[PDB]
Scaffold this active site. Structure first.
Site, short mmCIF file in Angstrom:
data_model
loop_
_atom_site.label_atom_id
_atom_site.label_comp_id
_atom_site.label_asym_id
_atom_site.label_seq_id
_atom_site.Cartn_x
_atom_site.Cartn_y
_atom_site.Cartn_z
N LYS A 1 0.97 -1.21 0.21
CA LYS A 1 -0.38 0.09 0.24
C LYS A 1 0.62 1.38 -0.26
O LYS A 1 0.09 2.51 0.49
CB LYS A 1 -1.06 0.17 1.58
CG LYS A 1 -1.39 -1.34 1.68
CD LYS A 1 -1.92 -1.72 0.01
CE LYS A 1 -3.01 -0.73 -0.63
NZ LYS A 1 -3.03 -0.75 -1.95
N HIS B 1 8.24 -7.06 -1.83
CA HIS B 1 7.66 -6.06 -0.06
C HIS B 1 8.56 -6.88 1.35
O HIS B 1 8.31 -6.21 1.86
CB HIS B 1 6.33 -5.95 -0.18
CG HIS B 1 5.65 -5.18 -0.96
ND1 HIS B 1 5.13 -4.60 -0.92
CD2 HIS B 1 4.54 -6.03 -1.19
CE1 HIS B 1 4.54 -4.07 -1.85
NE2 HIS B 1 3.86 -5.11 -1.92
N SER C 1 -5.12 3.00 3.67
CA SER C 1 -5.76 2.29 2.97
C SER C 1 -5.12 0.98 2.84
O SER C 1 -6.19 0.08 2.05
CB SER C 1 -4.20 2.65 2.10
OG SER C 1 -3.54 2.05 0.88
N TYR D 1 6.12 8.60 -1.73
CA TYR D 1 4.74 9.01 -2.14
C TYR D 1 4.52 9.97 -1.77
O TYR D 1 3.64 10.33 -3.39
CB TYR D 1 3.93 8.39 -0.93
CG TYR D 1 2.84 8.45 -1.97
CD1 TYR D 1 2.35 7.31 -2.62
CD2 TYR D 1 1.68 9.89 -1.30
CE1 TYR D 1 0.78 6.90 -3.54
CE2 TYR D 1 0.38 9.04 -1.61
CZ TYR D 1 -0.37 8.31 -3.03
OH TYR D 1 -1.12 7.93 -3.00
N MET E 1 -4.77 6.32 -14.11
CA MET E 1 -4.03 4.79 -13.94
C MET E 1 -5.32 4.20 -13.40
O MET E 1 -5.44 2.78 -13.38
CB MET E 1 -2.83 4.44 -12.82
CG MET E 1 -1.87 4.98 -13.24
SD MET E 1 -0.75 5.01 -11.67
CE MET E 1 -0.64 3.45 -11.50
N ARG F 1 -8.28 3.69 -4.59
CA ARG F 1 -8.99 3.87 -4.01
C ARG F 1 -9.17 5.13 -3.74
O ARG F 1 -10.64 5.52 -3.76
CB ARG F 1 -8.35 2.71 -2.78
CG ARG F 1 -9.67 3.39 -1.36
CD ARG F 1 -8.90 2.57 -0.12
NE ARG F 1 -8.44 3.37 0.71
CZ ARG F 1 -8.63 4.75 0.73
NH1 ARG F 1 -9.56 4.98 1.53
NH2 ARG F 1 -6.86 5.50 1.73
N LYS F 2 -8.32 6.05 -3.52
CA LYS F 2 -8.40 7.53 -3.19
C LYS F 2 -7.24 8.18 -3.36
O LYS F 2 -7.33 8.86 -4.21
CB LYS F 2 -8.40 7.94 -1.80
CG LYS F 2 -10.33 8.32 -1.05
CD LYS F 2 -10.55 8.82 0.06
CE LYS F 2 -11.27 8.73 0.53
NZ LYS F 2 -12.97 8.46 0.12
N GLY F 3 -5.77 7.42 -3.07
CA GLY F 3 -5.22 8.47 -3.56
C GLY F 3 -4.51 9.69 -3.45
O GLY F 3 -4.02 9.83 -4.08
N1 LIG Z 1 -1.24 7.41 -9.90
C1 LIG Z 1 -1.71 7.39 -8.36
N2 LIG Z 1 -1.90 8.07 -8.08
C2 LIG Z 1 -1.79 9.00 -6.79
N3 LIG Z 1 -1.69 7.53 -5.73
C3 LIG Z 1 -1.97 6.17 -6.23
C4 LIG Z 1 -2.09 6.39 -8.16
N4 LIG Z 1 -1.93 4.69 -8.25
C5 LIG Z 1 -2.18 4.30 -7.04
N5 LIG Z 1 -2.24 5.23 -6.38
C6 LIG Z 1 -2.31 5.25 -4.42
O1 LIG Z 1 -1.54 4.14 -4.05
C7 LIG Z 1 -1.90 3.27 -3.07
C8 LIG Z 1 -1.91 1.47 -3.42
O2 LIG Z 1 -0.73 1.21 -3.46
P1 LIG Z 1 0.49 0.09 -3.55
O3 LIG Z 1 0.15 0.40 -5.32
O4 LIG Z 1 1.07 0.23 -2.75
O5 LIG Z 1 -1.05 -0.78 -3.39
C9 LIG Z 1 -4.13 3.31 -2.94
O6 LIG Z 1 -4.16 4.65 -1.91
P2 LIG Z 1 -5.15 4.82 -1.01
O7 LIG Z 1 -5.99 3.80 -0.37
O8 LIG Z 1 -5.20 6.08 -0.12
O9 LIG Z 1 -6.53 5.78 -2.52
C10 LIG Z 1 -4.22 4.27 -4.25
O10 LIG Z 1 -5.49 4.91 -4.45
#
Ligand SMILES: Nc1ncnc2c1ncn2[C@@H]1O[C@H](COP(=O)(O)O)[C@@H](OP(=O)(O)O)[C@H]1O
Ligand SMILES: [Ca+2]
Length: 282
Positions: free
Chosen positions: A41, A88, A118, A173, A212, A239-241
């Site tokens: 995440k 990871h 997340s 991030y 994305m 989800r929310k990013g």
């Molecule tokens: N292009 C992007 N820009 C910003 N956040 C992104 C993104 N792509 C994925 N995410 C966010 O990355 C998180 C997931 O992480 P991972 O790649 O390690 O699985 C999610 O967080 P959220 O739950 O806050 O939305 C997702 O929303």
């Protein structure tokens, strides 16, 4: 037969053969190999998606390395091209041989309150993860590290130990949301690749969350390529990013507690404090 299991004191999905995991150091790195490292995440795809969008760089992005049977090693030795290899794993379990070659690492990192959430979310929505009913249940585990891949704090720290090594670059991030291009550079660079303003601007275009987020099928050839060992449905990750939400789940108590463990574990971790200059203003 569980959804999760524990190896050396850390929970893993049963989609990571234990075979695979006792065998890791039998991994034979390539001086050139790359590793995109993170705790769950944490920008993983973001990062990996970003890599693939780099043009004619010559890189095959690879399915997670702790995902599957011993054979995954097999699968791995056959990639004629340069490997960007997602994981990871914590430091310790990272294959010695990778340590020995000093393969470049990119370890991405995000404030842990946002990660937790997340995450919790990910336990909720993912059938490879034994869901948890309420937020507060999951946090307790998180703080214990009783989640897959273990304690946030440990992940980060182990890694942070090598933050000043030449083949290593940390990324935040957060810093991706803020000024994505300043970041991208930082990388392209670490990787010593030239890519221009136009081009970089194209990647930015191609990689926006919502960008994305529009998706449903395949990448460059046929069978779906998984990049996070846990995830089989990419539709699940967006989800929310943003940064911050955690202000919509932490109770004053959970925060106090959080800030104390955080401050207890992340004592004098530079990274610690940087993640603090962020929600400091954020
Ligand atoms: N292009 C992007 N820009 C910003 N956040 C992104 C993104 N792509 C994925 N995410 C966010 O990355 C998180 C997931 O992480 P991972 O790649 O390690 O699985 C999610 O967080 P959220 O739950 O806050 O939305 C997702 O929303
Ligand atoms: Ca040490």
């Amino acid at each position: 037969p569980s959804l999760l299991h524990k190896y050396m004191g850390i929970f893993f999905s049963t989609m990571s053969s234990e075979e695979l995991l006792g065998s890791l150091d039998s991994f034979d790195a390539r001086e050139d190999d790359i590793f995109l490292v993170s705790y769950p995440k944490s920008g993983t795809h973001w990062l990996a998606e970003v890599i693939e969008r780099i043009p004619d760089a010559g890189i095959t992005l690879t399915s997670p390395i702790e995902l599957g049977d011993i054979s995954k090693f097999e699968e791995l030795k056959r990639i004629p091209k340069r490997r960007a290899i997602p994981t990871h794993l914590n430091y310790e379990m990272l294959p010695v041989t990778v340590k020995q070659k000093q393969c470049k690492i990119i370890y991405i990192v995000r404030n842990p309150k946002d990660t937790a959430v997340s995450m919790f979310h990910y336990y909720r929505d993912n059938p490879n993860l034994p869901s948890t009913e309420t937020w507060a249940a999951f946090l307790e585990l998180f703080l214990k590290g009783d989640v897959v891949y273990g304690s946030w704090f440990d992940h980060v720290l182990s890694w942070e130990e090598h933050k000043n090594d030449k083949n290593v670059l940390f990324i935040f991030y957060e810093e991706m949301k803020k000024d994505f291009v300043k970041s991208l550079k930082k990388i392209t660079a670490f990787l010593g690749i030239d890519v221009n303003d136009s081009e970089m601007a194209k990647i930015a275009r191609s990689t926006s969350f919502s960008e994305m987020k529009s998706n449903a099928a395949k990448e460059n050839c046929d069978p779906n390529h998984v990049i996070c060992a846990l995830t089989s449905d990419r539709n699940l990750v967006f989800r929310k990013g943003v940064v911050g939400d955690w202000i919509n789940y932490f109770t004053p108590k959970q925060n106090r507690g959080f800030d104390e463990l955080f401050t207890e574990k992340m004592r004098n971790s530079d990274v610690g404090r940087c993640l603090k200059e962020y929600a400091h203003s954020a």
